[PDB]
Nucleic acid binder design. Sequence first.
RNA 1: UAUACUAACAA
Length: 122
Amino acid sequence: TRVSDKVMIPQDEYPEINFVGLLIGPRGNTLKNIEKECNAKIMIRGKGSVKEGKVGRKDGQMLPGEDEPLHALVTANTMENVKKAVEQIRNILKQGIETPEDQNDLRKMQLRELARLNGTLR
RNA sequence: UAUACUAACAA
């Protein structure tokens, strides 16, 4: 008895940017956070998901990157738990680094969650 | 020049 629900990333305009980053966190703060909240399982699948085609780490495609577009598959037990979980996740992607007019100034805040956490805050 | 980027977990 497990429910699934991934978050679609606007790969039509943006590649994967901090969508995978912010959604993850340092090592995976955002991932484990929502995981400990509604008992969900965050796992981004697609091109830029497991830092296999980005910078920082080593290069060398290991997982197929021609099928999955760019989404963060979040599992759980009930649709309710995964629902609220996906909600926050959207607040991270939907806004990403080009957050709506609601904020915009805090567009870089998605990087502060990790920064202020590891002292990486300006 | 934190001018913040973090990639895990899984695949």
